[PDB]
Design an enzyme around this catalytic site. Sequence first.
Site, PDB file in Angstrom:
ATOM      1  N   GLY B 256      52.613 -20.223  56.641  1.00  8.22           N
ATOM      2  CA  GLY B 256      52.906 -18.628  56.493  1.00  8.22           C
ATOM      3  C   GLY B 256      54.442 -18.488  56.359  1.00  8.22           C
ATOM      4  CB  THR B 261      56.781 -18.518  47.236  1.00 13.73           C
ATOM      5  OG1 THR B 261      55.513 -18.460  47.368  1.00 13.73           O
ATOM      6  CG2 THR B 261      57.722 -17.477  46.504  1.00 13.73           C
ATOM      7  CB  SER B 285      46.348 -24.517  39.599  1.00 13.44           C
ATOM      8  OG  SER B 285      47.741 -23.973  39.457  1.00 13.44           O
ATOM      9  CG  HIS B 350      50.102 -20.335  40.965  1.00 13.33           C
ATOM     10  ND1 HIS B 350      51.152 -21.073  40.829  1.00 13.33           N
ATOM     11  CD2 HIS B 350      49.039 -21.370  41.303  1.00 13.33           C
ATOM     12  CE1 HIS B 350      50.800 -22.268  40.762  1.00 13.33           C
ATOM     13  NE2 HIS B 350      49.773 -22.446  41.172  1.00 13.33           N
TER      14      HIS B 350
END
EC number: 4.1.1.9
Lengths: 416, 414
Positions: B256, B261, B285, B350
């Site tokens: 987390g 990202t 993916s 994504h």
Amino acid sequence: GTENLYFQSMDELLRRAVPPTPAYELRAAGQCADFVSFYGGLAETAQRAELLGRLARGFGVDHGQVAEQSAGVLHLRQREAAVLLQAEDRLRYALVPRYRGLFHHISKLDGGVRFLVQLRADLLEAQALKLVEGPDVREMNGVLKGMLSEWFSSGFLNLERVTWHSPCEVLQKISEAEAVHPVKNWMDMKRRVGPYRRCYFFSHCSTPGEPLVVLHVALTGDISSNIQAIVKEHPPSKITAAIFYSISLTQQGLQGVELGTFLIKRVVKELQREFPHLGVFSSLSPIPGFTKWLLGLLNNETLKLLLSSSEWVQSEKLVRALQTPLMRLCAWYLYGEKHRGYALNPVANFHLQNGAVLWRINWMADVSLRGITGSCGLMANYRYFLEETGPNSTSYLGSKIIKASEQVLSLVAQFQ
Amino acid sequence: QSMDELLRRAVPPTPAYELRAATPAPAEGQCADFVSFYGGLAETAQRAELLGRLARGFGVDHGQVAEQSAGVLHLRQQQREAAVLLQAEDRLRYALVPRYRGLFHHISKLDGGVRFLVQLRADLLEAQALKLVEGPDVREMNGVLKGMLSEWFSSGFLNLERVTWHSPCEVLQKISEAEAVHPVKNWMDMKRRVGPYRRCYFFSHCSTPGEPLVVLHVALTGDISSNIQAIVKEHPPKITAAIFYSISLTQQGLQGVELGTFLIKRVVKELQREFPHLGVFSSLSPIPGFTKWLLGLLNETLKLLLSSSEWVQSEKLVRALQTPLMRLCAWYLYGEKHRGYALNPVANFHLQNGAVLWRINWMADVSLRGITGSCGLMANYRYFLEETGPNSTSYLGSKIIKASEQVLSLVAQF
């Protein structure tokens, strides 16, 4: 005309650049870059002082909501464990100032933490030049000092050694940020990193080869009583004592993050690895603000106030006469003179915090222009007895006790 | 019994408000005893007992908070000095900081301290998952700890490292072992994945260089790839598109902290620096949990038995299941929600980053894990850099999924 436009712009930028605080219920679900841009474009320190003063005062805590939350916790004290914790967290959230969210989001930027170090360096300067005042700027200082103390903790700093193999940009950085005993020429700098000398600094893991704090060590056979004897010495290619003759903070923004306290702790462990038969560690430290305190007391013994300004050292009769009196007044300035219950002298407070002993007072240790005008030639040895640095650190911070040698305590017995 | 006595002598005490800035000398030795006792705990149930006691016993002094809360309210009834109130507010602010935070703080300064704390959060997450620890006190302590870890593993504290055949084999082994998407077959396969027309990047903490936290595999191609075997099983000797075919995390304790990202963000900037005339970025993916969701719906009995690897063998069955499975996939990605957000974890990842559900690929991964995982189906989450910002905002904020006409046509069929 264009001045009232500069003032109008700050208030607008702080509104649209300081990120807003979301409701405690929605605390889970570009502005900052505008701030960094506008702050960068500020030329003088008085301009930056105006912006920091407005940020502290305008974007702190909502004092109204804090009282509502404080009462809300006290109303529950007359329910459930989870009910109490949610109201406590509501108050915890209410006590977080709106500027902290700006400092937090700025860090997330490229070179963000670097900017924030510079911004606290300026804030501490504006406070020193009395450009900013008030308890609001003091609070904003502590919030920043707190965040910086987490990013620059001991475990994120690397211990680097300075030799004549180091880049000259690093040696320049180390030479320039050296206010204790300034470097005369490049040949002096080569000696201070040369044989029988150890120069160490701390860099952040993120920025290697960038000094944050510097410590100069001299490998000698006795506890040094003179600085000239160290700086003006040509050693060749057995050591009994390690003398810390200079400790310097390169980044003024990190003033209070305990960088010097951890530097000594680290360097001793490094010197114990290199010389496992070395058990003598002490400093040879300046007594800055002593002459100022002494002249401040002197407000005919009017000849004394006048003379104490470099030129007095020229007469051998005057120096010889002033030995025993200035040494007992120094002993009191170090041991007896207090500030908020702690040692008045900042250098003495530093070493006593670290667990050092106020071991010796040295007469005419620094006969330099800054040495005579600063501490009347006097220097002191804050001795590190590693076996007892822990309890001494505790006794000083906790019970405000200064551990001193019989020599030092005799000079205080002469006084009062 | 030992845990209660140890914690009392290993958790550093809350210093006086006046001395809240100074590191106590015993606090190093106290925290080293904790690390030693924690290490000597074998089973997770033992570690769960210690963490549960730490959260509950070493949080906030609820008594002092009420004294400070009343002290602030006593200074409201009478309009006192500005500095008098602020000092009282700060004392309450200090009273609301838990005693365990000072332990986590002093442990970090230790050699291998932050590494220990990552493992301790990995265990805390596990003990919570196995319901060994429960309560709002352990939940608060996981937030306090995650908060601290989210600052130490911030983009500014991470290095972007590139993996070539010049990298140590210990790093390549670590990276081969970290593969949580399309496993590496042999050392010759690993050499290809770091080789020409391939870019492999990782994140290491500035403190530990050459130790990967998160890995991203990029393929430099002339089109948006529709097949994984076309990438992994290829011998390359102008590049139009950059395809992200694998993203892997190495530390469960950093669950987390938003590492993936920031890797895509930093790798794109690095790819643009290398290739200024590159404007096509997309992923290839997989769709994990699709077959599980599809079989979960089937509770129509023949397909419940057949959908377990062996069904792909019949050309008549595959051809027939092309149009139905793709419309069910389109719905699983676009229509199926979890707490209002995309049901699929990979799609959520994504879409958060600002990608667009661009294409659904039939028989993209004909591997054993590819057929049993997503029925051979894969998808392209396309990164239009000019609009990643608003797309990221629209998804997190208004829960909107931006999709291609191809994808939306398959949802129109459904």
